[PDB]
Amino acid sequence: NNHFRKHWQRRVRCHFDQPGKKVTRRLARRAKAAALAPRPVDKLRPIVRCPTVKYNRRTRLGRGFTLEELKAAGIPRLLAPTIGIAVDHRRKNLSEESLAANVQRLKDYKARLILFPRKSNKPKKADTPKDQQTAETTTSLRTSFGVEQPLAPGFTEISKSEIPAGIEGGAYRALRKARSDARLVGVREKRAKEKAEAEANKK
Amino acid sequence: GALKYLEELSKKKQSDVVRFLLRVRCWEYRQLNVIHRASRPSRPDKARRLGYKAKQGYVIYRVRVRRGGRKRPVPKGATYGKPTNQGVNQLKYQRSLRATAEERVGRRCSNLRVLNSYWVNQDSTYKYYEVILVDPNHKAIRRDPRINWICNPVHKHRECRGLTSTGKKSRGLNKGHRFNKTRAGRRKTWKRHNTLSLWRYR
Amino acid sequence: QEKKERLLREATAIKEGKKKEDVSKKPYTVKYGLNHVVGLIENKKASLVLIANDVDPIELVVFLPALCRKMGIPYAIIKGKARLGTLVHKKTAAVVAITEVRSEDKNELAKLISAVKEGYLEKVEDTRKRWGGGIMGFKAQKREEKRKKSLETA
Amino acid sequence: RRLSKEDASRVLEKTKKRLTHFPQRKYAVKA
Amino acid sequence: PVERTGLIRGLNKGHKTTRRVLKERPSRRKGAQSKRTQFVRSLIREVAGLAPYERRVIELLRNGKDKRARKFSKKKLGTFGRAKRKCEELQRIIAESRRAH
RNA sequence: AGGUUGACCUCGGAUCAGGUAGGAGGACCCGCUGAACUUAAGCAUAUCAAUAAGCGGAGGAAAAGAAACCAACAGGGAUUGCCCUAGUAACGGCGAGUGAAGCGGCAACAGCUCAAAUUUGAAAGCUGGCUUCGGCCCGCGUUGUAAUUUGGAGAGGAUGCUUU
RNA sequence: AAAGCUCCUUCGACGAGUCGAGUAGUUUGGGAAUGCUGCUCAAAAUGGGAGGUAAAUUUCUUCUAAAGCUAAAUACCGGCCA
């Protein structure tokens, strides 16, 4: 299983520039942080659940918050990308739980936000006052607003009187019955339709 | 206004009025030169939706191209290699006749930029196209933020590099599973898939 | 020049603290521009429509008689887009429309509308549905006349 | 042949309105 | 939306959540008829008339050969669904002409 | 004066006023065109290879790019690149061989402009010339130049606070 | 003067020889499921595309093509400096 039948020597990529590229990336990050100070170096991201049945046990960071999440948090969609919040217009909220989690995330960020006035001599009422502008800040939203609990807890404890009775017949029999019903959903519907037609014909 | 009606009427290409207009205009454009300047677009709604404006610096050039397949210019139309099980009458050009028309109009007006083009007519011998061009040196163009992106040097000869609409279609730049080989660039994707990557700590 | 003088008067009125409508009256002008006139016909604001007979491409105005007939607007086909351009201070004009006139010309407008209805639309009511063209050349016409004469003689 | 700085910095009226009322703000986030 | 069963297999399977009702996205309005578009298409149909293959299908439908009309429309357009929609539209045109005459 | 005097449309001329392209370079980049040696016992499918050579076109990067996407989940969410997916799904004379993608971790992240609407109580737009730098003219343009809207919406209303 | 937020009876235009179909050549892992191009036919309005086995019927899920712009992370046997 050796794929060396093409002119492979023309397209060999070595990586001797790995430490140099790491140094260049760190220099670029330092320059971006110095240019963006006192703002954090990154944008606030929502918590999303990974697709497919393999990865839906785990949550991670998404692209941006939804318009519904911004509306429920009270943050206008034009103000949001100017105060460090990422916006994603494609994503929708199919269920209430993720919507509530991301709305609470936005409200925590809004409670921790310090908003400097556009003009120092003319502050507005949406702006943070000068007596509150001084506080210990964070510069990594991926760290301070990360995924705290990416998986469910793998172990809890309950009293022995709170042990559930379980599904009737057993979980194995419940799984077998669910698979059988899914396989026979159409045949039983056709049989019921034929029986109803026969009953209507010979009532 | 009237351009909605023009679009709905241009959909009906087999109606009597559109067939008559196509016939007389095909005769007239066959009488004219192979590449010639049009004073105004013959399909104003199509030109407007492709981006034409009635502004100093937008021009329309009409061009006819010979239709059909492509011939390999080998002596006597026959190859001297391994048998191909096909004739030169069945070779297909990977670009469109629209793209060939845009290239020839760009060479005719090398001072301008090709914005887009559209079909206007065809017969058995020729397909007929109208190409919209923009003058990047006209100050009415240069002052307009909707169009002055075309004044930058990276947009020199988009029709030659396949950056027009027909070029994007021919290069297959669409998202998804049907365009796996081409969506990032076919030769670039091939080079990425055929590069042997060796790390230091391997 | 008239617009500049009107804007000067309105600017003076604003300077002395009056609205521009205090010194500017309601205008009554010929409506022009193809999209503008088409929208006026669709909203039935146009009282009379004049369509130029020499529009190239003809698709711009080919639907306009049918639109005016569906919306009940009196129309007439007239000779000269340049003639309409002289009306609207342009080189050419594809279509013009009268929506409203002044009260001293309302009777003239009604008379012109009735004259158009009685002397153009009723006269072209049947000929507008007929096919045009199909005319032979001079030599072909003479050849066919000679052939018909020979067939009648023999 | 490069575009002049004024022509390169020209913006549309809608973009100008959006930049006038929602520019990039200075801000900090507490920890 | 129907509540999921909480199981990994079977009908209505999957993890239970409280499904919301979304206001419909404006990108999904495509295909809806509008008054202006209906008006313009009606006027353009009146001005331009019919295609020759449409006249052929109308003649077949007037003669009553519906299977002929569907087969010829599939040959002309390409797909069975487009042929069916075209045959229904031309039957509506024939019915409107009959109720007018 | 009307056998005249003009208005437009199309098409021309000028060493007319002001501009622009060509060639070089081509390591990398975007396309077109396109082999054979080789490997298959030989050999017209195949492989080498959608490679070399040939032709056109760019930049400091280029290209791609804000879903007519992936998915089938408790759903993700523009593009690019690395790691993995994976020598896997799949394709393949007489078999030599060929071979992706979604998810997942990371690097980096940024979003938008038109056409389809009547400003219609006022083409509100723009090239050029002359300027006393206040403007004034020749024009383009209604077969549509500004403002407004782009599907995440928007338009019309209602409503009361904020913004520059 | 312009702009944002909240609510609503209503309205809500959305790209055609294009999509798609057949056929031929080429290409692809997609020689049942790929893309491109030529010729012929040639659309629609909850329409249209996709949902990797052909078709009819009934559902469902996702987007919204046929116009356009855009930094970074990526490449670099050319040039310049180290």
Automatic annotation (TrEMBL), chain A:
Belongs to the eukaryotic ribosomal protein eL13 family. One of its GO terms (molecular function) is RNA binding. GO terms for cellular component: cytosolic large ribosomal subunit. Residues 131-143 have a biased composition (Polar residues). One of its GO terms (biological process) is translation. This is 60S ribosomal protein L13. Residues 117-159, 183-203 are annotated as: Disordered. Keywords: Ribonucleoprotein, Ribosomal protein. The keyword Ribonucleoprotein applies. It comes from Chaetomium thermophilum (strain DSM 1495 / CBS 144.50 / IMI 039719). Pfam families: Ribosomal_L13e. The keyword Ribonucleoprotein applies.
UniProtKB/TrEMBL annotation, chain B:
Residues 164-185 are annotated as: Disordered. Mg(2+) 2 binds at T84. Pfam families: Ribosomal_L15e. GO terms for biological process: cytoplasmic translation. One of its GO terms (molecular function) is RNA binding. Residues 168-185 have a biased composition (Basic residues). GO terms for cellular component: cytosolic large ribosomal subunit. It comes from the Eukaryota. Coiled coil: none annotated. Mg(2+) 1 binds at Y80. Keywords: Metal-binding, Ribonucleoprotein, Ribosomal protein. InterPro entries: Rbsml_eL15_core_dom_sf (IPR024794), Ribosomal_eL15 (IPR000439), Ribosomal_eL15_CS (IPR020925), Ribosomal_uL23/eL15/eS24_sf (IPR012678). Belongs to the eukaryotic ribosomal protein eL15 family. NCBIfam families: PRK04243.1 (NF003269). This is Ribosomal protein L15. It comes from Chaetomium thermophilum (strain DSM 1495 / CBS 144.50 / IMI 039719) (Thermochaetoides thermophila).
From TrEMBL, chain C:
One of its GO terms (cellular component) is cytosolic large ribosomal subunit. The lineage of its organism: Eukaryota, Fungi, Dikarya, Ascomycota, Pezizomycotina. One of its GO terms (biological process) is ribosome biogenesis. This is 60S ribosomal protein L8. Component of the ribosome. It comes from the Eukaryota. One of its GO terms (molecular function) is RNA binding. Signal peptide: none annotated. Residues 16-109 form the Ribosomal protein eL8/eL30/eS12/Gadd45 domain. Belongs to the eukaryotic ribosomal protein eL8 family. Keywords: Ribonucleoprotein, Ribosomal protein. The keyword Oxidoreductase does not apply. The keyword Nucleotidyltransferase does not apply.
From TrEMBL, chain E:
It comes from the Eukaryota. Keywords: Ribonucleoprotein, Ribosomal protein. Residues 1-37 are annotated as: Disordered. InterPro entries: Ribosomal_eL36, Ribosomal_eL36_sf. GO terms for molecular function: structural constituent of ribosome. GO terms for biological process: translation. Pfam families: Ribosomal_L36e (PF01158). Residues 12-33 have a biased composition (Basic residues). One of its GO terms (cellular component) is ribonucleoprotein complex. PANTHER family: 60S RIBOSOMAL PROTEIN L36. Belongs to the eukaryotic ribosomal protein eL36 family. This is 60S ribosomal protein L36.
